[PDB]
């Protein structure tokens, strides 16, 4: 039901829980790297420009 | 929060034993019985363990000594109630 | 019920030594962070009441491309040191100061004559160095009250760019905030660094006062 | 692609721009000048560096 | 012929106008190219991919 | 109507069977949002049948890629037309010219890195005017298979859900036409007599003792795929002979 | 430093009903651009409007259908109403009603007068009729609001139309030189705004300044 209290729980748990981002053709080891999630309103991953 | 682990790896120049010892500390802090030795700043057990290694008060040997002492205390106190 | 917006509050003001600070405002309306930051930045680095040296004359200098015997610093270096020489003066608009010294060692700002109501905020500021005991330096500086930055190119007298404005460096950074329900908000984080004449918070408050006073004919 | 273009544009010199030749006491007032528009971003000057 | 059609209107012939920034209100040097390109919306929507 | 085309737009639009080209020229007589009537000219009128053309426009219908094929008139009443003229323009067409998308004021310049590799920065005006808004028509179907343990029924009486989930469904267990359904709701509530097992060691007796009636009524449902909202624009029911089509049918 | 001058409104050159030209004078060095940019941002961002929100047509269930006798699709009617301009004075919300019959365009003037609400563009075409026997009876709900409010974030007859609570449409400012008060180096500001007619330029400028002052009131 996506209440108003679940979002606070999600914020509490996302703090220090790295996630792995991995593009399809992982040619070399850099093709998969971990980032700390930041909650973004939308439907698309916002990926740092440098990587 | 944490950005890097380079100081911790500098203190344990293996980059892999660091992961195992930090995992053991986080497990001990999550089951956990024990409590952080560094002022907790609203961080999960992983960050606490890595920062606590960064301070230089834990590595494999210190943790092993602590576990041995805890087992000795359990043996003694459990023995006192028995005999 | 259609006019009130999220009124910002200074949620936190962390700072460094009193010449530097960092002011965080949160939560600002969508896009209000940029307008407040830009207005405050422009007002602070463009027109702020303040005074600083404008023109200095040496006893034996007649062109800016000149030199004095017995001084480590040439004319350009000493002009630069005077450029950042922070000075505070009372209601007097323009006041002339005198500097005389001879003796091997640095020529600190505090060694300028203390007569008058002029107050110096950085006593240990280095103005010039001299090596020869026989050589001497005698200087008179002119500080005036102005309304921003006046490069010398705008038109034995040597001119110095008048850095009236107290703020040395100012920059703002708009970051995303969050509220219980709304998400697309702004968090203004002003990063201010003054010359020491006034505290950063006092400078921000004076800038806000000026900008609000500019709007007294509307509100 | 865009960071490199930005830095290349920043760190360059033309023969003459606004406020060419003036002497500056440090990077901070250089930024203060550029934001206020007194001297162009690419103007040969003399700066005191630490 | 593109230049001629530009010149028929009051628009600049070079095809580049001077754009002021929305946020800081300051001018962009190096006037930029501005026009009306015909853009499509491809049938690859994020909610069909997320 | 793309500002910079190639002149081939009209040929593509008219040739493809999306626009309603006028078979015979004449004068429009009655044109509403779903029909165009042409009064054939005296010259072109065939000897005999009289014989004024009627064009039925195809309103919102599903396409093979979940897109809406919508034909709308582009002519006003009393407007003459010629043979081969365009009367209604289909989807992504304008006055007989193929216009796939929109055109908008574009400016080539790096903007704070928000267009780093090839990304595009859109002004909120484009969203406000709703000029890239696209209608997608999605078809959802539930089947009542003659499975063992009895057949399946499309009744509205469903367990494990109160009247709150049944609010949109009518008395016949089907959603109203025009309901503003959302993700996770029930479209066509079907419950199968093909449900769950018979009494085993007083299963029903123990359920009655507890206080809850667990029956052969097992809840299937045709629920909208999660996260998809929209409006129900049509409901079609197909029934084999001798099945006693329900009230909604 | 005799302290800065205080800008004040000097003129309003109302070129047309829709777009006007406000003037502010005097302004010191730098203050012209700063105030102009701040007012542009505030004006474009936040100004109360009266965009249509809900429409209840009698014979329509959803926006993806058609009514016999109406040339345009229903969704076209909803879009045209989204384009509507309306000004109310005494109420946060009002429920306009429209009844028209006979061949001819249905202009906004056909909306019942309800004198407390003024329609600023009577010629705004909403829909066309085809035959004399086709009738439209649609209830329009208009309410006060701010910014852009989509239909998604907020019976089956009601049709929801995206709100566009933004009377302004284009703000342009240029700073000029005004040799006034026998003094030079004083700039005059001109704020040429083009609204939809649902707000007076003087009220818009005053409200923008009020918003900016309230925001600044945090640390004054």
């Amino acid at each position: 039901r996506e209440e108003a209290v679940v979002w606070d729980i999600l914020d509490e748990v996302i703090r220090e829980h790295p996630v792995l981002l991995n593009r399809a053709p992982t040619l070399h080891r850099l093709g998969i790297q971990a980032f700390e999630p930041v909650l973004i309103e939308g439907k698309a991953i916002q990926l740092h420009p440098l990587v | 929060a944490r950005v890097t682990v380079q100081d911790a790896v500098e203190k344990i120049g293996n980059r892999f034993d660091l992961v195992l010892v930090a995992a053991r500390r986080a497990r001990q802090m999550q089951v956990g019985g024990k409590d952080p030795l560094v002022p907790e700043e609203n961080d999960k057990t992983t960050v606490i363990a890595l920062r606590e290694i960064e301070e230089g008060l834990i590595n494999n040997q210190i943790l092993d000594v602590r576990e041995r002492q805890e087992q000795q205390e359990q043996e003694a106190a459990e023995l006192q109630a028995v005999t | 019920s259609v006019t009130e917006f999220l009124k910002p509050r200074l949620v936190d003001i962390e700072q460094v030594s009193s010449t530097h600070a960092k002011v965080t405002l949160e939560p600002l309306e969508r896009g209000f962070g940029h307008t407040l930051g830009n207005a405050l930045r422009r007002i602070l680095l463009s027109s702020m009441p303040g005074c600083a040296v404008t023109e200095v004359e040496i006893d034996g200098v007649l062109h800016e491309y000149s030199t004095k015997e017995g001084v480590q610093e040439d004319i350009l270096e000493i002009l630069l040191n005077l450029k950042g020489l922070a000075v505070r003066v009372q209601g007097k608009d323009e006041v002339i100061l005198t500097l005389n010294k001879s003796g091997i060692g640095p020529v600190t700002a505090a060694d300028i004559t203390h007569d008058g109501d002029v107050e110096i905020v950085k006593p240990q500021h280095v103005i010039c160095h001299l090596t020869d005991e026989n050589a001497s330096i005698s200087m008179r500086i002119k500080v005036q009250r102005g309304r921003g930055y006046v490069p010398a190119s705008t038109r034995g007298r040597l001119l110095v760019d008048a850095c009236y404005s107290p703020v040395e460096r100012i920059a703002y950074n708009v970051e995303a905030a969050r509220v219980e329900q709304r998400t697309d908000l702004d968090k203004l984080v002003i990063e201010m660094e003054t010359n020491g004449t006034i505290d950063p918070e006092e400078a921000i408050r004076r800038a806000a006062t000026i900008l609000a006073e500019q709007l007294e004919a509307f509100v | 692609q865009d960071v490199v273009l930005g830095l290349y544009y920043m760190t360059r010199d033309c023969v003459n721009a606004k406020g060419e030749g003036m002497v500056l006491t440090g990077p901070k007032e250089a930024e203060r000048l550029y934001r206020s528009g007194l001297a162009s971003l690419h103007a040969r000057v003399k700066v005191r560096i630490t | 012929e593109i230049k001629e059609l530009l010149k028929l209107g009051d628009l600049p012939t070079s095809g580049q106008i001077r754009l002021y920034d929305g946020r800081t209100g300051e001018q962009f040097e190096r006037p930029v190219t501005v026009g009306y390109m015909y853009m499509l919306k491809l049938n690859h929507l994020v909610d069909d991919k997320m | 109507k793309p500002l910079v085309g190639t002149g081939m737009e009209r040929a593509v639009a008219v040739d493809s069977g999306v626009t309603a080209v006028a078979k015979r020229g004449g004068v429009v007589q009655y044109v509403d949002a779903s029909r165009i009537v042409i009064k054939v000219n005296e010259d072109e009128m065939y000897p005999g049948e009289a014989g004024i053309d009627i064009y039925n426009l195809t309103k919102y219908t599903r396409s093979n890629q979940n897109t809406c094929i919508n034909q709308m008139p582009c002519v006003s009443l009393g407007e003459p037309v010629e043979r081969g003229d365009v009367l209604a323009d289909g989807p992504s067409t304008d006055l007989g010219e193929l216009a796939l998308g929109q055109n908008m004021r574009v400016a080539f310049m790096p903007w704070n890195g928000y267009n780093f590799e090839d990304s595009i920065l859109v002004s909120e005006r484009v969203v406000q005017e709703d000029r890239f808004t696209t209608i997608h028509i999605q078809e959802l179907a539930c089947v009542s298979r003659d499975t063992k343990l009895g057949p399946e029924e499309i009744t509205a009486d469903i367990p494990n859900v109160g009247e709150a989930a049944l609010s949109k469904l009518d008395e016949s267990g089907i959603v109203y036409i025009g309901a503003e359904v959302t993700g996770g709701d029930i479209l066509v509530g079907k419950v199968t007599p093909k449900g769950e097992t018979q009494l085993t060691p007083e299963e029903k007796l123990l359920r009655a003792i507890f206080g809850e009636k667990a029956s052969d009524v097992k809840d299937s449902s045709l629920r909208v795929p999660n996260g998809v909202s929209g409006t129900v624009i049509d409901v079609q029911v197909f029934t084999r002979d001798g099945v006693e089509k329900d009230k909604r049918a």
Side-chain angles (χ1 to χ4, degrees), chain C residues 42-215:
Chain C
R42 287 188 61 81
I43 288 180
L44 278 155
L45 62 83
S46 190
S47 54
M48 274 289 295
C51 56
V53 303
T54 314
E55 48 192 343
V56 73
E57 311 88 320
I58 307 317
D59 61 358
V61 180
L62 59 88
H63 292 357
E64 57 85 19
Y65 285 163
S66 305
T67 175
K68 183 65 189 67
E69 318 303 325
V71 291
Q72 163 175 34
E73 283 90 349
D74 63 358
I75 306 308
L76 294 178
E77 301 300 313
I78 189 164
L79 287 198
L80 276 183
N81 305 107
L82 301 172
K83 201 185 198 304
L85 179 65
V87 174
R88 287 209 280 101
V89 186
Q90 297 295 336
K92 294 192 302 188
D93 290 19
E94 54 174 327
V95 62
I96 192 167
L97 297 77
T98 61
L99 173 53
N100 302 328
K101 171 185 295 306
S102 197
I104 297 169
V107 184
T108 63
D111 292 329
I112 301 179
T113 185
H114 199 191
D115 189 5
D117 54 359
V118 178
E119 191 166 330
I120 303 303
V121 300
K122 190 61 173 296
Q124 322 84 329
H125 211 305
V126 172
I127 289 175
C128 65
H129 288 187
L130 62 83
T131 51
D132 194 279
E133 191 89 330
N134 303 117
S136 183
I137 179 64
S138 66
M139 294 177 71
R140 48 176 62 178
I141 62 170
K142 195 78 189 104
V143 301
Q144 311 181 26
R145 195 169 305 269
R147 290 183 290 274
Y149 198 106
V150 176
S153 59
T154 298
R155 273 300 316 170
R157 196 187 315 275
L158 297 182
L159 294 174
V160 188
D161 307 339
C163 179
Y164 303 106
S165 158
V167 308
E168 182 65 26
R169 179 181 79 90
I170 179 167
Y172 74 97
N173 197 17
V174 170
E175 205 174 285
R178 181 175 60 264
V179 192
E180 276 96 7
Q181 273 184 149
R182 259 178 293 184
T183 53
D184 190 311
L185 263 70
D186 307 344
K187 160 190 164 188
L188 182 51
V189 181
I190 307 286
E191 177 173 349
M192 172 94 91
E193 185 172 338
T194 71
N195 58 9
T197 60
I198 53 181
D199 276 319
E201 296 177 18
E202 164 61 10
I204 294 178
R205 290 185 189 282
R206 285 192 186 182
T209 294
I210 292 174
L211 186 47
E213 180 172 333
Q214 290 282 262
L215 303 173

Side-chain angles (χ1 to χ4, degrees), chain F residues 29-35 59-60 70-77 124-125 127-130 135 176-180 231-234:
Chain F
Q29 192 63 247
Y30 162 82
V31 62
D32 46 3
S34 69
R35 174 160 40 196
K59 302 317 302 185
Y60 301 94
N70 186 3
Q71 302 191 10
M72 37 165 60
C74 68
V75 305
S76 60
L77 190 149
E124 198 170 9
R125 179 61 55 79
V127 188
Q128 280 200 45
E129 304 203 326
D130 276 312
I135 289 175
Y176 290 97
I177 306 173
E180 305 170 358
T231 318
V232 165
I233 70 175
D234 269 308

Side-chain angles (χ1 to χ4, degrees), chain A residues 30-46:
Chain A
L30 296 168
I32 184 169
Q33 301 184 15
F35 311 98
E36 292 199 351
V38 166
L39 263 51
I40 296 301
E41 284 284 3
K43 297 175 179 292
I45 292 165
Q46 289 191 340

Side-chain angles (χ1 to χ4, degrees), chain C residues 2 5 7-8 25 28 31-32 36 38 42 47 213-214 217-218:
Chain C
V2 298
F5 301 162
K7 300 299 293 295
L25 288 68
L28 277 164
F32 275 28
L36 276 296
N38 179 74
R42 287 188 61 81
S47 54
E213 180 172 333
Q214 290 282 262
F218 306 143

Side-chain angles (χ1 to χ4, degrees), chain C residues 80 83-84 149 161-163 167-169, chain D residues 22-36 38-39 46-48:
Chain C
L80 276 183
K83 201 185 198 304
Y149 198 106
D161 307 339
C163 179
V167 308
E168 182 65 26
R169 179 181 79 90
Chain D
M22 59 174 56
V23 61
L24 308 183
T25 177
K28 316 199 176 223
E29 74 163 359
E31 181 182 29
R32 189 203 325 163
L33 280 193
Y34 169 64
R35 300 309 302 278
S36 52
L38 272 295
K46 294 185 177 299
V47 176
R48 173 182 283 169

